[PDB]
Design an enzyme around this catalytic site. Structure first.
Site, short mmCIF file in Angstrom:
data_model
loop_
_atom_site.label_atom_id
_atom_site.label_comp_id
_atom_site.label_asym_id
_atom_site.label_seq_id
_atom_site.Cartn_x
_atom_site.Cartn_y
_atom_site.Cartn_z
N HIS A 86 -51.53 8.82 10.03
CA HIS A 86 -52.36 9.85 9.41
C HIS A 86 -52.66 9.83 7.92
O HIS A 86 -53.84 9.78 7.56
CB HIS A 86 -51.79 11.22 9.78
CG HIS A 86 -52.08 11.54 11.25
ND1 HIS A 86 -53.18 12.06 11.78
CD2 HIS A 86 -51.22 11.28 12.28
CE1 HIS A 86 -53.02 12.10 13.08
NE2 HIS A 86 -51.84 11.64 13.36
N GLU A 142 -50.67 -2.59 7.53
CA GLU A 142 -49.94 -2.04 8.64
C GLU A 142 -48.89 -3.06 9.04
O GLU A 142 -49.18 -4.18 9.46
CB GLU A 142 -50.89 -1.76 9.79
CG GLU A 142 -50.20 -1.27 11.05
CD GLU A 142 -49.21 -0.12 10.85
OE1 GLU A 142 -49.62 0.97 10.43
OE2 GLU A 142 -48.02 -0.31 11.09
N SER A 168 -49.21 9.17 17.85
CA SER A 168 -47.96 9.52 18.53
C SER A 168 -48.14 10.93 19.09
O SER A 168 -47.68 11.19 20.19
CB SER A 168 -46.76 9.48 17.56
OG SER A 168 -46.43 8.18 17.03
N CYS A 169 -48.77 11.74 18.43
CA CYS A 169 -49.02 13.17 18.90
C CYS A 169 -49.88 13.15 20.35
O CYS A 169 -49.96 14.17 21.04
CB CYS A 169 -49.84 13.83 17.78
SG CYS A 169 -49.74 13.18 16.13
N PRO A 174 -45.55 5.66 4.01
CA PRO A 174 -44.67 4.90 4.89
C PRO A 174 -44.09 5.77 5.97
O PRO A 174 -43.53 5.29 6.95
CB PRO A 174 -43.65 4.34 3.96
CG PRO A 174 -43.49 5.43 2.95
CD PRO A 174 -44.91 5.90 2.72
N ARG A 219 -52.87 14.25 6.61
CA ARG A 219 -54.28 13.93 6.52
C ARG A 219 -54.83 14.61 5.28
O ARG A 219 -55.46 13.90 4.49
CB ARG A 219 -55.05 14.38 7.81
CG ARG A 219 -54.87 13.41 9.01
CD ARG A 219 -55.60 13.80 10.28
NE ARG A 219 -56.84 13.06 10.62
CZ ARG A 219 -56.94 12.19 11.65
NH1 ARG A 219 -55.94 11.84 12.48
NH2 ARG A 219 -58.13 11.76 12.06
C1 LIG Z 1 -43.92 12.48 19.43
C2 LIG Z 1 -44.62 13.04 18.19
C3 LIG Z 1 -45.47 14.14 18.36
C4 LIG Z 1 -46.09 14.73 17.26
N1 LIG Z 1 -47.00 15.70 17.47
C5 LIG Z 1 -47.72 16.24 16.47
C6 LIG Z 1 -48.67 17.21 16.76
O1 LIG Z 1 -49.01 17.42 17.93
N2 LIG Z 1 -49.34 17.84 15.69
C7 LIG Z 1 -49.08 17.44 14.37
O2 LIG Z 1 -49.47 18.15 13.44
N3 LIG Z 1 -48.21 16.44 14.14
C8 LIG Z 1 -47.52 15.85 15.14
N4 LIG Z 1 -46.53 14.89 14.88
C9 LIG Z 1 -46.20 14.55 13.46
C10 LIG Z 1 -47.21 13.54 12.94
O3 LIG Z 1 -47.40 12.53 13.93
C11 LIG Z 1 -46.79 12.89 11.63
O4 LIG Z 1 -46.64 13.94 10.70
C12 LIG Z 1 -47.89 11.90 11.22
O5 LIG Z 1 -47.60 10.72 11.95
C13 LIG Z 1 -48.08 11.55 9.73
O6 LIG Z 1 -47.19 10.53 9.27
P1 LIG Z 1 -47.54 9.48 8.10
O7 LIG Z 1 -48.99 9.23 8.05
O8 LIG Z 1 -46.81 9.86 6.84
O9 LIG Z 1 -46.83 8.21 8.71
P2 LIG Z 1 -46.06 7.86 10.07
O10 LIG Z 1 -46.69 8.48 11.24
O11 LIG Z 1 -44.62 8.07 9.86
O12 LIG Z 1 -46.35 6.26 10.16
C14 LIG Z 1 -46.36 5.42 8.98
C15 LIG Z 1 -47.11 4.13 9.24
O13 LIG Z 1 -46.93 3.26 8.10
C16 LIG Z 1 -46.43 1.99 8.55
N5 LIG Z 1 -45.56 1.37 7.51
C17 LIG Z 1 -44.43 1.92 7.05
N6 LIG Z 1 -43.88 1.14 6.11
C18 LIG Z 1 -44.70 0.12 6.00
C19 LIG Z 1 -44.73 -0.92 5.15
N7 LIG Z 1 -43.73 -1.04 4.28
N8 LIG Z 1 -45.75 -1.80 5.14
C20 LIG Z 1 -46.76 -1.68 5.99
N9 LIG Z 1 -46.77 -0.69 6.87
C21 LIG Z 1 -45.77 0.22 6.87
C22 LIG Z 1 -45.64 2.30 9.81
O14 LIG Z 1 -45.55 1.21 10.73
C23 LIG Z 1 -46.50 3.40 10.42
O15 LIG Z 1 -47.50 2.78 11.22
C24 LIG Z 1 -45.84 14.26 15.95
C25 LIG Z 1 -44.99 13.14 15.79
C26 LIG Z 1 -44.40 12.52 16.90
C27 LIG Z 1 -43.51 11.28 16.69
#
Ligand SMILES: Cc1cc2nc3c(=O)[nH]c(=O)nc-3n(C[C@H](O)[C@H](O)[C@H](O)COP(=O)(O)OP(=O)(O)OC[C@H]3O[C@@H](n4cnc5c(N)ncnc54)[C@H](O)[C@@H]3O)c2cc1C
Length: 447
Positions: A10, A32, A41-42, A111, A303
């Site tokens: 996100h 990535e 994942s949601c 991350p 987001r």
């Molecule tokens: C089962 C589940 C259900 C959920 N349901 C909801 C919902 O319904 N509604 C809602 O509001 N939220 C929901 N969430 C929460 C939401 O998914 C997270 O808040 C959202 O994923 C945002 O995370 P992020 O973008 O910080 O990174 P993350 O989702 O934690 O992912 C980070 C990405 O960066 C990549 N990355 C990390 N380090 C490196 C690196 N060093 N180099 C290159 N790539 C890297 C990882 O591989 C990953 O792909 C849910 C989460 C889960 C697991």
């Protein structure tokens, strides 16, 4: 100018979206670590529960589509280090192993997080799964149709642990939810809601084992027993949905971390390093219910932050508006939503609140479609300004919670919501709707 964006989930994704809107002429690199760009994942539970059949359709962007738009997409490429003064990062192609360094002008990282795992004996037995991303989604799905999973224990009773419990319970399995917390979903709902959800879960044959500390996993080769301080539970599968660790240890010493790994950032998403921005589950966010900063690990949050990181690239111009931490979910027949402060969040902030719950038919007496709906309105004891609400019904009334999110944001009071103009039409609601009735009750409670 060149802008590197770490992460395709996100916060990552929305930073390259807004880079394409405000900076369409910038060299963008999107990295990535894994093989698949932007998995939702949601969406895991709709896939797990069978409504979505293709696990690769459970996404919202492809690398290819971004490349069509001028974006340099490097999947299977892991940023291994950031060198912020040198304005460079080190990346490592994970399929070839080649290490390389890339220069950036601005770097935006999301991350995110990783499942928390219990470091208990037996932690290395087969069939102890986690629930985040595509590979775990596929592995979990195959377990829903496996003839040898008969009992599955999911450890952790939050949003994810209950989604997992519901998916495997509907899959035909015998589920037990074990957790030290004493109510399922307590982070989201108060007792008068989670008792109804505990009975609905129990009618769907799930055992809610709260108040229990998991001691050890027992089994020969593959896990066979989850044993707690007050009981031993049979397990052909364990799903560990206990918490999320920030994926930031690699940043210890590079950027300033909060005592729990969360990256320190300001209102304009800037880290302690010049030209490095951080966003998403690994950061704090402005929580307008109690005018504070709190970690709320939600899609919606990352987001809006991913977009704001971009807005503030050159100069600190748009401070983040803050969020109320709104969430919604259906647990078997019940659809609930909540925003702002509830019993647990108030305990965790040490914030004193006052509140009312109204459980009654949300449609008038003569209308045959009437059903109980539960609404709790939490406000400040001194100002009576709105601090949060929770609603629940087998009828989907969840959209009503967005109103509450804006009233909290706008600092409205129980008197304001009491006479707020919300439409009435008898097939849809009662003359003073769900929100007006709870607020009318709070007003009466404060007479
Ligand atoms: C089962 C589940 C259900 C959920 N349901 C909801 C919902 O319904 N509604 C809602 O509001 N939220 C929901 N969430 C929460 C939401 O998914 C997270 O808040 C959202 O994923 C945002 O995370 P992020 O973008 O910080 O990174 P993350 O989702 O934690 O992912 C980070 C990405 O960066 C990549 N990355 C990390 N380090 C490196 C690196 N060093 N180099 C290159 N790539 C890297 C990882 O591989 C990953 O792909 C849910 C989460 C889960 C697991």
């Amino acid at each position: 100018m060149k802008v590197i964006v770490l992460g395709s989930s996100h916060g990552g994704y929305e930073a390259v979206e807004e880079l394409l809107n405000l900076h369409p002429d910038a060299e963008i690199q999107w990295y990535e670590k894994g093989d698949f760009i932007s998995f939702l994942s949601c969406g895991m539970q709709l896939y797990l529960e069978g409504k979505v059949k293709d696990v690769n359709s459970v996404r919202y962007m492809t690398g290819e589509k971004m490349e069509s738009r001028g974006v340099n997409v490097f999947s299977n490429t892991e940023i291994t280090a950031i060198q912020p003064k040198e304005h460079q990062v080190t990346v490592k192609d994970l399929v070839s192993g080649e290490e390389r360094v890339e220069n950036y002008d601005k770097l935006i990282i999301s991350p995110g997080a990783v499942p928390f795992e219990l470091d208990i004996p037996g932690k290395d037995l087969d069939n102890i799964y986690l629930m985040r991303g595509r590979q775990w989604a596929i592995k979990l799905k195959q377990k829903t149709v496996d003839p040898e999973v008969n009992n599955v224990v999911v450890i952790g009773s939050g949003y994810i642990g209950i989604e997992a419990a519901e998916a495997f319970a509907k899959a035909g399995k015998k589920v037990t939810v074990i957790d030290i917390l004493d109510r399922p979903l307590g982070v989201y709902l108060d007792k008068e809601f989670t008792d109804v959800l505990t009975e609905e879960m129990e009618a769907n044959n799930i055992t809610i084992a709260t108040g229990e500390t998991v001691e050890r996993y027992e089994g020969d080769g593959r896990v066979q027993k989850v044993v707690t301080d007050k009981n031993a539970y049979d397990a052909d599968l364990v799903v560990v949905a206990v918490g999320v660790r920030p994926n930031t240890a690699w940043l210890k010493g590079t950027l300033e971390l909060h005592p729990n790994g969360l990256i320190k950032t300001d209102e304009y998403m800037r880290t302690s390093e010049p030209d490095v921005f951080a966003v998403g589950d690994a950061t704090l966010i402005k929580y307008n219910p109690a005018d504070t900063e709190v970690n709320i690990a939600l899609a919606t949050n990352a987001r809006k932050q991913g977009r704001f990181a971009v807005k503030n690239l050159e100069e600190p111009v748009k401070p983040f508006p803050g969020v109320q931490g709104s969430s919604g979910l259906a647990v078997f027949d019940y659809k609930f939503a909540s925003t702002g402060i509830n019993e647990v969040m108030a305990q965790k902030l040490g914030k004193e609140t006052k509140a009312v719950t109204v459980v009654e038919d949300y449609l008038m007496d003569f209308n045959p479609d009437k059903q109980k709906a539960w609404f709790k309105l939490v406000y400040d004891p001194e100002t009576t300004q709105i601090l949060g609400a929770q609603l629940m019904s087998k009828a989907d009334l969840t959209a009503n919670i967005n109103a509450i999110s804006l009233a909290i944001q706008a600092k409205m009071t129980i008197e304001d919501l009491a006479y707020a103009d919300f439409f009435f039409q008898p097939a849809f609601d009662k003359p003073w709707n769900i929100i007006n009735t709870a607020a009318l009750e709070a007003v009466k409670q404060e007479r």
